[PDB]
Design a protein around this ligand. Structure first.
Ligand SMILES: Nc1ncnc2c1ncn2[C@@H]1O[C@H](COP(=O)(O)OP(=O)(O)O)[C@@H](O)[C@H]1O
Ligand SMILES: Nc1ncnc2c1ncn2[C@@H]1O[C@H](COP(=O)(O)OP(=O)(O)O)[C@@H](O)[C@H]1O
Ligand SMILES: [Mg+2]
Ligand SMILES: [Mg+2]
Lengths: 23, 514, 542
């Protein structure tokens, strides 16, 4: 007989950065 | 491949060859001296230089097993799989025999562990560190790396025992050797001179030369099969190579008219250090680098810079004045540093900074954000032009129309030592002759009369007149006739006023008196 | 590999040996006092200091069971095997005998929760916590860890009962580096003229593997100087030459002059070659700089005898093109302390709070490889006066200077770091920097005088053929207002005319002629302006 198996590895996220303006 | 298939990278190739083969050829020497040899190399340089070719050649010349690992290939999204891939690769390499592991583009899988956010990157970094160093880490197997930016790697990876050796794989003789070795298997011709190729292709990395040769060889057959013993008398000629190059300016000491003394001085000061390094080493002194041009606009300063850049085998990086400033904090200085790093990364090179009045501006004091930005830009330029550098071969050439607004730190000797002034009918005759080189002319036209009626025009005005004459000739067609010049002469511009001429004369007189 | 291979960290070595050995050798003491020993170690420090070497040593020596776990090697493709792997590992470790566990790169499988995504990481961290300290936590088992970034570990793991004693295996001192050098050179055959005591002193920041690299490089150079001279003999190695092998002191000097500490590999300065004889004039400034630099490092016993720390900072200011950066080059070339050159706006960044991270990184690098000379070139850019600007540039350019203030004189352990500043507008730097403890001594470097300019000319022509009947004093007495760069330009033009004459003749002219040099002097420059020299003169007078 056969059998199943579960697997959950990872995902992908998004970050936000701040910049500085010298006019 | 083999050791004979490598050219130009002579010293680094020899160093890698000895450090890899001496353990393999005979380990008795290292047993006698009682020290283990280095077991890691970090190659760095621009892409397409021949680094993986060198690794493959060394692996072929020795009884090794070249195993290639790509950066993006091994990285995956699954958890605990990329590390398993690296472990399996190392186990395979160590299983069979003493081998060479070439892991390409490690910078993609070595993000310094601080600027990254994905846990898989840190995990594979740690796996690499454990594999290279640790309990029974390596047993007679060497690893080779490759990257474009060696800075973006873990400090733990640039340690001894992992990447103890760093090799810089970045000239004319190497380029000629590559040309010779890439055309060894084809009979090109009898009148093809490789000196022009080694002098004209002055910006080729080395992998582009193979593409150039293949393209020329393919185009030779492409042009020699439209109509068609045929195998006899086959091969490429100079025309095919020129076409391949056509598929970085086109001037040679002819498009510039007049200014003979300026031409001679520039030619001497630029060609002497390039042609005779031996003489300067005997005299034990460095050459002058900087030249500044000032005068009215549209006089031919860019043309002169291109004309003095072309005869040498140097590159040419022309940047406008305001073509680098940014609204952000530290972007202009980053651009300046990148420009100079590129300029000194391919020696010799001439850098043409245009409109210094926009960059220098005589920083002094302005009390503003723009003032601070100008101060920082000026300081960065000052440090790069003459600072904690090596000044191998860099020829900064300046060009502005308002030298009075330059700080006395860039005009200082050693940065822009030569203060050349660029200012006649006899010169205008030469300018017209150089402009009308390849043109069907009429015997009846007299350029002397045209030059006599200028009385203070610039080369831009002469080019405008020539363009109007060409437009009239094309309008008539749809040789150049005299009436086109007659009707185009009336519509003169004379964009340069008189007060600016007085200002330039005063500046030149003050400089001469100083 | 045993306990004698590792040297330079005797204190940390004993700290680990006590808990790894005494509970297993003499357990009667702890039952007599009735306190169980500490069980857990976290070796941290810069990479290559010898953490894995110390683990190997304690493994090969003790008769107790040793189990090795690597960081990323515990997790697998399927969900729920990292925890199963850890369970099996600990069960095997505790199944049979008192055991030692050693986790390489614990930072790779112990990320700080609340800042990491992915549930498997959290689950494996929790499983590790439960294994090391939970109900019926452990039964006579010791755990050791090794990491380079301890701060990136779950605080629940850095508690007593899990990791109670965090030993700091850091960079050795001169004695430790001497011990490391002596241990590494025990099997390699050297020459009788090689002295280890002197060689250890020049190295400052070299830690462990760095020293090993030095030794290996020296051996390689020795091999390559004479192996090439003799036949390769690929068929067999001649026995007579094998007994002639060794390493000379010159080999070690050559290998040392090329190598740099692994920490400061990213900030390596190019091999620019200047010497004290190459700087003409300003001899008193030269001697003052030598005094303030090389007294602290060569004679530290005197300073502790007097019970005072030395002065650190210096700032050269003056007209452009006089020898400021030249003095920096000379210091970088012929001084034992490490050099970290930095350009003026080089450290600034696009983003928010990164110019200060850059400053932090370079100053931590300087403090790690002490003594160190940090040369800030064109201080007028980053060290701008706070004052008032009313803009984001003012906001960012004010934050960067404040970081400098707290980094040179803040909460630090007085490590040797000498800051050299070089500016051309010394009125435009905040007075909070031009203060003792930051840059105490302000050296003004005027234009050279007759004797100084003549000395500059003599230094510049050190390696130039000259006619026997040349009198440089005359050109020196007929010059006023010039700078060293202008005299250099005069020399360059004279050389260029000599080269022109040589090429025209083509050794027709094996020297620079007085006529060539006069032609060069014809186009005198006078770089610096008298209208602007009065600014420096007024500033110095004030
Ligand atoms: N020094 C060299 N000698 C001979 N061929 C070269 C050299 N450098 C590059 N090439 C050519 O470039 C091609 C690919 O170069 P490669 O080494 O893969 O680039 P990279 O250095 O980016 O790995 C090869 O087919 C090879 O013939
Ligand atoms: N002496 C000259 N001989 C030939 N062409 C010239 C001369 N001076 C100017 N020109 C022409 O006029 C144009 C001048 O442009 P450019 O030199 O870039 O401006 P600027 O002189 O302000 O640097 C060029 O396209 C060039 O062909
Ligand atoms: Mg280790
Ligand atoms: Mg300087």
């Amino acid at each position: 007989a056969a059998a199943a198996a579960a697997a959950a590895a990872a995902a992908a996220a998004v970050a936000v950065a701040v910049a500085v303006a010298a006019a | 491949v083999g050791y004979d298939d490598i050219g130009g990278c002579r010293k680094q190739m020899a160093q890698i060859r000895e450090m890899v083969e001496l353990p393999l050829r005979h380990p008795q020497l290292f047993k006698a001296i009682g020290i283990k040899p280095p077991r890691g190399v970090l190659m760095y340089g621009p892409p397409g230089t021949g680094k993986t070719l060198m690794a493959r050649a060394v692996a072929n010349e020795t009884g090794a097993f070249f195993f290639l690992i790509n950066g993006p290939e091994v990285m995956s999204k699954m958890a605990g799989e990329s590390e398993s891939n690296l472990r399996k690769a190392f186990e395979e390499a160590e299983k069979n025999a003493p081998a060479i592991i070439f892991i390409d583009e490690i910078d993609s899988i070595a993000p310094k562990r601080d600027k990254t956010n994905g846990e898989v990157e840190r995990r594979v970094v740690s796996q690499l560190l454990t594999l290279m160093d640790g309990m029974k880490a390596r047993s007679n197997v060497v690893v080779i790396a490759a990257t474009n930016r060696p800075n973006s790697i873990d400090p733990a990876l640039r340690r001894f025992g992992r990447f103890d050796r760093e090799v810089d794989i970045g000239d004319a003789t190497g380029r000629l050797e590559v040309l010779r070795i890439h055309t060894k298997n084809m009979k090109l011709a009898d009148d093809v001179d490789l000196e022009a190729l080694a002098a004209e292709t002055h910006g080729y990395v080395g992998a582009d030369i193979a593409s150039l040769c293949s393209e020329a060889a393919m185009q030779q057959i492409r042009e020699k099969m439209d109509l068609i013993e045929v195998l006899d008398s086959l091969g490429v000629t100079m025309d095919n190579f020129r076409f391949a190059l056509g598929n970085s300016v086109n001037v040679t000491w002819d498009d510039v008219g007049g200014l003979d003394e300026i031409k001679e001085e520039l030619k001497e000061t630029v060609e002497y250090p390039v042609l005779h390094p031996d003489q300067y080493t005997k005299f034990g002194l460095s050459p002058s680098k900087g030249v500044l041009f000032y005068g009215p606009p549209g006089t031919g300063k860019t043309l002169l810079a291109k004309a003095v850049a072309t005869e040498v085998s140097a590159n040419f990086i022309s940047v406008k004045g305001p073509e680098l400033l940014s609204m952000w904090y530290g972007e202009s200085e980053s651009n300046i540093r990148d420009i100079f790093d590129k300029a000194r990364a391919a020696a010799p090179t001439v850098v043409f900074l245009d409109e210094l009045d926009s960059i220098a501006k005589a920083r002094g004091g302005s009390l503003g954000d723009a003032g601070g930005a100008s101060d920082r830009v000026v300081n960065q330029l000052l440090t790069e032009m003459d600072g904690m550098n090596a000044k191998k071969n860099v020829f900064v050439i300046g060009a502005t129309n308002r030298p009075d607004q330059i700080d006395p730190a860039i005009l200082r000797p050693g940065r822009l030592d030569q203060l050349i002034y660029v200012p006649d009918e006899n010169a205008r005759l030469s300018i017209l002759n150089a402009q009308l080189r390849k043109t069907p002319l009429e015997p009846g036209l007299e350029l002397t009369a045209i030059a006599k009626a200028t009385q203070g025009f610039s080369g831009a005005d002469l080019l405008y007149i020539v363009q109007r004459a060409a437009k009239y000739a094309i309008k008539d067609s749809i040789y150049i006739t005299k009436e086109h010049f007659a009707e185009a002469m009336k519509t003169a511009k004379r964009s340069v006023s008189d007060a600016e001429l007085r200002r330039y004369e005063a500046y030149s007189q003050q400089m001469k008196a100083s």
